[PDB]
């Protein structure tokens, strides 16, 4: 069901006067980040020369980068990993924008290239040389390697082994090409060269890569009566700069002009595209007259030795204003077309087209046939698709932004099983890679959330003992995000995400202590301590402490003070969990899980050892029992609760004695507080099918530091940072840096879980 | 002061610290929570008003010429008094931020000349405007105009 997700517009942006039209650009990154520019001409020129950065999770707040460009910006490109942006305009001024302090709301540039007076018509990054192939036939192969297969292209400009070199290449309005390379340091090497001795107008240009480390550049004059030239380019760094070797390739001529019936129509070429970057064997052309347009595809297949032929041509089209290409790497083999046709699986067989009406068309790739038509009830000037191709962003000839939901079925009814298989196959692609899944969450129904979660749970298992080790955080986060959509399972999300924290605080402590004398060789301290704790089921804590070699657990008595907040949080969580017995609660999942209880159980023996080493770092219990060991009381109940679930498939219910003894607990131990981290602010849980949402700018229709357990005032003083997905808030500049746990702070400088 | 010096010393020796709020909260939230429980759940308006509140002897309005919709406005005046004759319009210019300042009168010497009555009015006008104090308003000047015309008419007959 092709639908409209939400339309975003900005107040006061419209009502421009004396404004000639200017072309626009758009760019979608690996993460759900949109970079674009819009025609404003509102009381200042620079509003038309700003870079707008948008995050799809929070459309209402937009970031503006005041680029110091002198002419209209031509093109915008993202890197292979969405950490840098390439922007270029007329009169040179190619800029490389870098993220500031790992904040998406601050950008700064220090690298650039410049050629004086020549507008840039083509610009691209260099290739890294890694791609994958997806087979829909093997969607049930039960093997990650079997599903997504390596294709093994070759990288360009390999230096000192198999590590590629980064840089960019640009083609100007004339027959001029510039190449820039980046050293591992801040050094940059730039060079320029002429394509060929034939110097003429190059109105349109395109750049593609080929296997072996070669670049194919296509130039079009735009008169529809002249050939489109093709050139081959090789870049080599001879010890001081990048030299360019260029040679000529066979050209072609436009169709729909030898028909000898009506050739005066379509007198100008307006679009020249490559069907897919790194796929240089297919070229799409789009010509248009003042009223109608034609779109054609050509290929360089082997039957001169190399010739360009015709593949498809549409009947009749209106004026073409925007074209968008898919990004999903379909295998395109013969055996896959039949299984992608019988099953409604069309994520990479569509090309998106826009016209001067409110009509948007999805046309088949190999043969230009229309399959999906959308009417808006104005025209679209710039637009883009997604990696999974579940949605497309569009900019109209106004201040509006649109996001449209594309479904794989495209209106054809399907059963539940096929939809579940499609969704899990698409999710595993984002599992293998580092890409997000917001557009995937745009289409998941609330009814089939539980089936998806459970089936993904068994998909996580039965891997070859290595994929599970590096996908635990992702497998937790994906299902935590999934479970918040269905109101039946909306209450279990806090059981997942908080659980994640319990690993982190436990992972940094077992590696924080380094023994000054080794004991029990061929065993890490964490493993030996865990097996000792799971080998002894003694009721109280004093007997267990004896045989752990207390003389070794010694620290520098400086990081111990910085750990006080974490230990206090652990103790408060233990107290809350023990007091939650007499109760569907945010802490219900930990009662029936044995590993979490066990880990929390050995988490406290070490802090008992540290507290007997230093009493100031102990968590401050507010118990009304001066002569009774509160933490030993907690340990006794924790051990009693642990033995009831450590059995392999216990299926047992706690006895009434435990219930009443935990009932008596709050009469002795106060429960201070607790904070729920998954603050519901995303738009995924708010949108509804066939219910478009119209949101405006800056509308957006007990504050704690969640990373380090520090309380702020009624109104916080210093500015902070907010996570996009989880929504956690943490202080920007930490107060204690000379005396802090550097093993804990360094784990969150780049991203949050 | 008395009985509370230790608190002042502690606060002054603790202030402008990055963890002051955390310290205060951690040291003073639990007792307060336990004892009491949960916490609480163009043309400026002044000119328009002064024109609205003038005697119906005057029907001042915007000048057809000159600029408008700015801080400085121009007004043309007409006098309709049964007991007084007709006189030159006596236009005025109002600068921006009319309160806490005074307007100025654009003199037109040739208009008031060639008649003993009109130049007598003019010299009485100069005398009265020299007698007016600072920070005056436009209604005072209009009343001065009316009274000067009346005095000149009385002196003539
Ligand atoms: Zn986060």
Tab-separated table of C-alpha atoms in Angstrom, chain A residues 359-679:
chain	number	residue	atom	x	y	z
A	359	UNK	CA	2.074	12.355	-9.958
A	360	UNK	CA	4.916	10.095	-8.792
A	361	UNK	CA	5.619	6.861	-10.668
A	362	UNK	CA	7.539	3.704	-9.771
A	363	UNK	CA	8.807	2.041	-12.950
A	364	UNK	CA	10.419	-1.366	-13.373
A	365	UNK	CA	14.201	-1.466	-13.754
A	366	UNK	CA	14.982	-3.899	-16.584
A	367	UNK	CA	11.901	-3.061	-18.680
A	368	UNK	CA	10.447	0.415	-18.234
A	369	UNK	CA	6.940	-0.532	-17.065
A	370	UNK	CA	4.825	1.349	-14.525
A	371	UNK	CA	3.679	-0.517	-11.409
A	372	UNK	CA	2.831	2.171	-8.823
A	373	UNK	CA	1.218	5.585	-9.333
A	374	UNK	CA	0.770	8.162	-6.562
A	375	UNK	CA	-1.229	11.396	-6.710
A	376	UNK	CA	-0.785	14.235	-4.210
A	377	UNK	CA	-3.988	16.062	-3.287
A	378	UNK	CA	2.602	21.589	-7.327
A	379	UNK	CA	5.472	19.325	-8.387
A	380	UNK	CA	8.600	17.706	-6.973
A	381	UNK	CA	12.058	19.126	-7.744
A	382	UNK	CA	14.443	16.929	-5.722
A	383	UNK	CA	13.999	13.517	-4.131
A	384	UNK	CA	15.852	10.458	-2.841
A	385	UNK	CA	15.297	6.834	-1.816
A	386	UNK	CA	16.573	4.632	1.021
A	387	UNK	CA	18.950	1.694	1.366
A	388	UNK	CA	16.015	-0.650	1.984
A	389	UNK	CA	13.855	1.413	-0.434
A	390	UNK	CA	10.945	1.349	2.032
A	391	UNK	CA	10.460	5.123	1.744
A	392	UNK	CA	11.376	8.150	-0.351
A	393	UNK	CA	11.912	11.780	0.648
A	394	UNK	CA	10.766	14.579	-1.639
A	395	UNK	CA	11.073	18.350	-1.896
A	396	UNK	CA	8.347	20.210	-3.782
A	397	UNK	CA	8.389	23.690	-5.303
A	398	UNK	CA	7.503	25.111	-1.872
A	399	UNK	CA	8.673	24.947	1.741
A	400	UNK	CA	7.235	21.465	2.257
A	401	UNK	CA	9.018	18.160	2.830
A	402	UNK	CA	7.282	14.836	2.209
A	403	UNK	CA	8.016	11.262	3.285
A	404	UNK	CA	6.156	8.485	1.459
A	405	UNK	CA	5.753	4.871	2.586
A	406	UNK	CA	6.583	2.290	-0.092
A	407	UNK	CA	5.420	-1.254	0.566
A	408	UNK	CA	6.982	-4.377	-1.003
A	409	UNK	CA	3.539	-5.784	-1.837
A	410	UNK	CA	2.438	-2.598	-3.668
A	411	UNK	CA	-1.219	-3.348	-2.996
A	412	UNK	CA	-1.160	-7.092	-3.678
A	413	UNK	CA	-2.602	-9.021	-0.704
A	414	UNK	CA	-0.292	-11.454	1.063
A	415	UNK	CA	-0.372	-13.894	3.961
A	416	UNK	CA	1.251	-13.284	7.342
A	417	UNK	CA	4.115	-15.729	6.825
A	418	UNK	CA	5.426	-14.112	3.648
A	419	UNK	CA	5.322	-10.662	5.256
A	420	UNK	CA	7.191	-11.967	8.309
A	421	UNK	CA	9.841	-13.598	6.110
A	422	UNK	CA	10.244	-10.395	4.081
A	423	UNK	CA	10.594	-8.271	7.219
A	424	UNK	CA	13.103	-10.610	8.879
A	425	UNK	CA	15.175	-10.882	5.689
A	426	UNK	CA	15.255	-7.086	5.454
A	427	UNK	CA	16.143	-6.766	9.154
A	428	UNK	CA	19.045	-9.209	8.843
A	429	UNK	CA	20.598	-6.930	6.213
A	430	UNK	CA	20.681	-4.080	8.740
A	431	UNK	CA	21.915	-6.653	11.277
A	432	UNK	CA	25.012	-7.540	9.246
A	433	UNK	CA	25.755	-3.881	8.445
A	434	UNK	CA	25.647	-0.794	10.636
A	435	UNK	CA	22.601	0.787	9.008
A	436	UNK	CA	19.464	1.842	10.870
A	437	UNK	CA	15.958	0.401	10.492
A	438	UNK	CA	13.542	3.340	10.871
A	439	UNK	CA	11.984	2.805	7.437
A	440	UNK	CA	11.620	-0.886	8.312
A	441	UNK	CA	9.767	0.084	11.501
A	442	UNK	CA	7.543	2.325	9.355
A	443	UNK	CA	5.836	-0.792	7.952
A	444	UNK	CA	5.663	-3.323	10.809
A	445	UNK	CA	2.088	-3.892	11.963
A	446	UNK	CA	1.292	-3.879	15.703
A	447	UNK	CA	-0.473	-7.247	15.428
A	448	UNK	CA	2.564	-9.285	14.315
A	449	UNK	CA	5.137	-7.740	16.673
A	450	UNK	CA	5.331	-10.783	18.968
A	451	UNK	CA	5.908	-13.222	16.102
A	452	UNK	CA	8.683	-11.028	14.692
A	453	UNK	CA	10.349	-10.700	18.108
A	454	UNK	CA	10.262	-14.424	18.867
A	455	UNK	CA	11.356	-15.498	15.377
A	456	UNK	CA	14.233	-13.016	15.516
A	457	UNK	CA	15.084	-14.532	18.911
A	458	UNK	CA	15.537	-17.982	17.394
A	459	UNK	CA	17.332	-16.354	14.436
A	460	UNK	CA	19.884	-14.953	16.897
A	461	UNK	CA	20.606	-18.447	18.226
A	462	UNK	CA	22.257	-21.416	16.453
A	463	UNK	CA	25.045	-19.284	14.977
A	464	UNK	CA	28.618	-20.503	14.643
A	465	UNK	CA	29.779	-19.291	18.085
A	466	UNK	CA	31.104	-16.000	16.666
A	467	UNK	CA	28.195	-14.002	15.226
A	468	UNK	CA	26.463	-14.118	18.617
A	469	UNK	CA	29.482	-12.551	20.333
A	470	UNK	CA	29.399	-9.385	18.193
A	471	UNK	CA	25.619	-8.987	17.733
A	472	UNK	CA	24.357	-9.046	21.342
A	473	UNK	CA	23.901	-5.275	21.611
A	474	UNK	CA	22.200	-5.100	18.207
A	475	UNK	CA	19.940	-8.087	18.908
A	476	UNK	CA	18.897	-6.463	22.192
A	477	UNK	CA	18.329	-3.000	20.700
A	478	UNK	CA	16.372	-4.205	17.660
A	479	UNK	CA	13.821	-6.128	19.719
A	480	UNK	CA	13.695	-3.358	22.341
A	481	UNK	CA	12.681	-0.959	19.565
A	482	UNK	CA	10.261	-3.523	18.101
A	483	UNK	CA	8.471	-4.279	21.386
A	484	UNK	CA	7.379	-0.662	21.979
A	485	UNK	CA	4.949	-0.612	19.034
A	486	UNK	CA	2.439	-3.214	20.255
A	487	UNK	CA	0.445	-2.113	23.332
A	488	UNK	CA	0.268	-5.765	24.410
A	489	UNK	CA	4.067	-5.889	24.825
A	490	UNK	CA	4.723	-2.173	25.388
A	491	UNK	CA	5.548	-2.816	29.065
A	492	UNK	CA	8.445	-5.225	28.405
A	493	UNK	CA	10.772	-2.671	26.756
A	494	UNK	CA	12.125	-1.458	30.105
A	495	UNK	CA	12.916	-5.113	30.836
A	496	UNK	CA	15.229	-5.201	27.794
A	497	UNK	CA	17.026	-1.857	27.545
A	498	UNK	CA	17.816	-1.580	31.258
A	499	UNK	CA	19.163	-5.138	31.050
A	500	UNK	CA	21.659	-3.853	28.476
A	501	UNK	CA	23.046	-1.386	31.024
A	502	UNK	CA	23.618	-4.293	33.418
A	503	UNK	CA	26.124	-5.802	30.975
A	504	UNK	CA	28.049	-2.557	30.503
A	505	UNK	CA	28.467	-1.759	34.204
A	506	UNK	CA	29.518	-5.393	34.663
A	507	UNK	CA	31.853	-5.481	31.655
A	508	UNK	CA	33.946	-2.491	32.742
A	509	UNK	CA	34.466	-3.761	36.309
A	510	UNK	CA	35.852	-7.251	35.621
A	511	UNK	CA	38.487	-5.676	33.340
A	512	UNK	CA	39.120	-2.692	35.632
A	513	UNK	CA	41.191	-4.749	38.088
A	514	UNK	CA	44.498	-6.244	36.935
A	515	UNK	CA	46.050	-8.762	39.359
A	516	UNK	CA	49.612	-8.040	40.457
A	517	UNK	CA	50.168	-11.808	40.765
A	518	UNK	CA	48.521	-14.397	38.535
A	519	UNK	CA	46.373	-17.157	40.024
A	520	UNK	CA	44.620	-20.117	38.369
A	521	UNK	CA	46.326	-19.891	34.943
A	522	UNK	CA	44.380	-20.164	31.681
A	523	UNK	CA	41.411	-18.426	33.360
A	524	UNK	CA	40.424	-14.768	33.371
A	525	UNK	CA	39.578	-13.211	36.759
A	526	UNK	CA	35.966	-12.740	35.687
A	527	UNK	CA	35.569	-16.377	34.653
A	528	UNK	CA	37.218	-17.742	37.801
A	529	UNK	CA	35.158	-15.454	40.044
A	530	UNK	CA	31.943	-16.431	38.230
A	531	UNK	CA	32.664	-20.158	38.519
A	532	UNK	CA	33.588	-19.774	42.201
A	533	UNK	CA	30.341	-17.894	42.861
A	534	UNK	CA	28.222	-20.419	40.941
A	535	UNK	CA	30.020	-23.342	42.628
A	536	UNK	CA	29.140	-22.207	46.179
A	537	UNK	CA	25.467	-21.766	47.099
A	538	UNK	CA	26.115	-20.685	50.685
A	539	UNK	CA	23.316	-18.699	52.302
A	540	UNK	CA	25.307	-15.768	53.741
A	541	UNK	CA	28.110	-13.579	52.429
A	542	UNK	CA	30.858	-13.962	55.063
A	543	UNK	CA	31.569	-17.622	54.263
A	544	UNK	CA	31.903	-16.974	50.521
A	545	UNK	CA	34.442	-14.141	50.903
A	546	UNK	CA	37.073	-16.341	52.577
A	547	UNK	CA	38.335	-18.277	49.539
A	548	UNK	CA	38.652	-15.493	46.931
A	549	UNK	CA	42.220	-14.388	47.820
A	550	UNK	CA	41.264	-11.001	49.238
A	551	UNK	CA	44.900	-9.813	49.192
A	552	UNK	CA	44.800	-9.452	45.381
A	553	UNK	CA	41.683	-7.261	44.963
A	554	UNK	CA	43.638	-4.018	45.360
A	555	UNK	CA	43.157	-0.842	43.308
A	556	UNK	CA	44.859	2.562	43.128
A	557	UNK	CA	42.335	4.003	45.667
A	558	UNK	CA	41.648	6.834	43.203
A	559	UNK	CA	39.322	5.222	40.652
A	560	UNK	CA	37.423	3.669	43.576
A	561	UNK	CA	35.909	7.026	44.572
A	562	UNK	CA	34.709	7.629	41.003
A	563	UNK	CA	32.938	4.240	41.094
A	564	UNK	CA	30.756	5.200	44.079
A	565	UNK	CA	27.764	6.258	41.961
A	566	UNK	CA	27.747	2.978	40.015
A	567	UNK	CA	27.889	0.927	43.220
A	568	UNK	CA	25.077	3.016	44.717
A	569	UNK	CA	22.988	2.398	41.593
A	570	UNK	CA	23.695	-1.343	41.822
A	571	UNK	CA	22.661	-1.412	45.478
A	572	UNK	CA	19.503	0.594	44.812
A	573	UNK	CA	18.574	-1.735	41.944
A	574	UNK	CA	19.161	-4.756	44.193
A	575	UNK	CA	16.955	-3.254	46.907
A	576	UNK	CA	14.194	-2.364	44.430
A	577	UNK	CA	14.263	-5.827	42.848
A	578	UNK	CA	14.108	-7.519	46.256
A	579	UNK	CA	11.250	-5.229	47.330
A	580	UNK	CA	9.341	-5.891	44.073
A	581	UNK	CA	8.504	-9.488	45.061
A	582	UNK	CA	5.135	-8.820	46.833
A	583	UNK	CA	3.624	-7.442	43.607
A	584	UNK	CA	3.342	-7.096	35.032
A	585	UNK	CA	6.010	-4.779	36.451
A	586	UNK	CA	9.028	-3.016	34.882
A	587	UNK	CA	11.160	-5.378	36.974
A	588	UNK	CA	9.271	-8.614	36.356
A	589	UNK	CA	11.643	-10.136	33.786
A	590	UNK	CA	14.610	-10.347	36.179
A	591	UNK	CA	12.763	-12.689	38.560
A	592	UNK	CA	12.620	-15.625	36.119
A	593	UNK	CA	16.052	-15.025	34.534
A	594	UNK	CA	18.966	-16.822	36.166
A	595	UNK	CA	22.024	-15.353	34.463
A	596	UNK	CA	21.136	-11.743	35.311
A	597	UNK	CA	20.456	-12.602	38.958
A	598	UNK	CA	23.706	-14.549	39.164
A	599	UNK	CA	25.753	-11.717	37.661
A	600	UNK	CA	24.126	-9.206	40.006
A	601	UNK	CA	24.984	-11.668	42.783
A	602	UNK	CA	28.725	-11.667	42.175
A	603	UNK	CA	28.592	-7.927	41.451
A	604	UNK	CA	28.359	-7.275	45.203
A	605	UNK	CA	31.027	-9.555	46.721
A	606	UNK	CA	33.725	-7.466	45.026
A	607	UNK	CA	32.248	-4.219	46.351
A	608	UNK	CA	32.080	-5.794	49.816
A	609	UNK	CA	35.807	-6.472	49.448
A	610	UNK	CA	36.390	-2.886	48.302
A	611	UNK	CA	34.298	-1.473	51.153
A	612	UNK	CA	36.292	-3.428	53.706
A	613	UNK	CA	39.346	-2.026	51.914
A	614	UNK	CA	37.877	1.507	51.916
A	615	UNK	CA	34.677	2.372	53.826
A	616	UNK	CA	33.983	5.747	52.181
A	617	UNK	CA	33.099	4.215	48.796
A	618	UNK	CA	30.313	1.986	50.146
A	619	UNK	CA	26.758	2.793	48.987
A	620	UNK	CA	24.864	4.791	51.605
A	621	UNK	CA	21.975	2.652	52.825
A	622	UNK	CA	19.207	4.450	54.727
A	623	UNK	CA	18.150	1.360	56.697
A	624	UNK	CA	16.665	1.713	60.179
A	625	UNK	CA	18.902	-1.071	61.519
A	626	UNK	CA	22.249	0.021	62.962
A	627	UNK	CA	23.246	-3.367	64.427
A	628	UNK	CA	22.189	-5.461	61.401
A	629	UNK	CA	24.254	-5.914	58.235
A	630	UNK	CA	21.897	-4.563	55.575
A	631	UNK	CA	23.927	-5.795	52.603
A	632	UNK	CA	24.231	-9.275	54.116
A	633	UNK	CA	20.446	-9.229	54.557
A	634	UNK	CA	20.136	-8.361	50.865
A	635	UNK	CA	22.599	-11.140	49.976
A	636	UNK	CA	20.600	-13.760	51.882
A	637	UNK	CA	17.372	-12.952	50.026
A	638	UNK	CA	19.229	-12.695	46.700
A	639	UNK	CA	20.742	-16.159	47.223
A	640	UNK	CA	17.323	-17.518	48.208
A	641	UNK	CA	15.780	-16.082	45.034
A	642	UNK	CA	18.686	-17.275	42.863
A	643	UNK	CA	18.490	-20.989	43.707
A	644	UNK	CA	14.820	-21.151	42.666
A	645	UNK	CA	15.687	-20.284	39.041
A	646	UNK	CA	19.224	-21.604	38.418
A	647	UNK	CA	17.771	-25.015	37.511
A	648	UNK	CA	17.727	-25.914	33.817
A	649	UNK	CA	14.115	-25.105	33.014
A	650	UNK	CA	12.862	-24.677	36.580
A	651	UNK	CA	9.169	-23.926	35.918
A	652	UNK	CA	8.753	-23.402	39.668
A	653	UNK	CA	6.889	-20.768	41.677
A	654	UNK	CA	8.359	-19.108	44.790
A	655	UNK	CA	7.127	-20.340	48.148
A	656	UNK	CA	5.060	-18.174	50.480
A	657	UNK	CA	7.943	-17.894	52.976
A	658	UNK	CA	9.982	-15.883	50.470
A	659	UNK	CA	6.921	-13.766	49.697
A	660	UNK	CA	6.367	-12.801	53.329
A	661	UNK	CA	10.065	-12.237	54.109
A	662	UNK	CA	10.280	-9.851	51.160
A	663	UNK	CA	6.991	-8.349	52.393
A	664	UNK	CA	8.770	-7.500	55.656
A	665	UNK	CA	11.670	-5.928	53.730
A	666	UNK	CA	10.250	-2.386	53.158
A	667	UNK	CA	9.573	-2.109	56.902
A	668	UNK	CA	13.376	-2.111	57.322
A	669	UNK	CA	14.790	-0.813	54.005
A	670	UNK	CA	13.469	2.308	52.300
A	671	UNK	CA	13.095	2.311	48.508
A	672	UNK	CA	14.647	5.625	47.349
A	673	UNK	CA	13.595	5.940	43.687
A	674	UNK	CA	14.088	4.607	40.170
A	675	UNK	CA	14.166	6.130	36.689
A	676	UNK	CA	12.872	4.622	33.442
A	677	UNK	CA	15.261	5.306	30.555
A	678	UNK	CA	13.123	4.556	27.423
A	679	UNK	CA	11.353	7.932	27.308
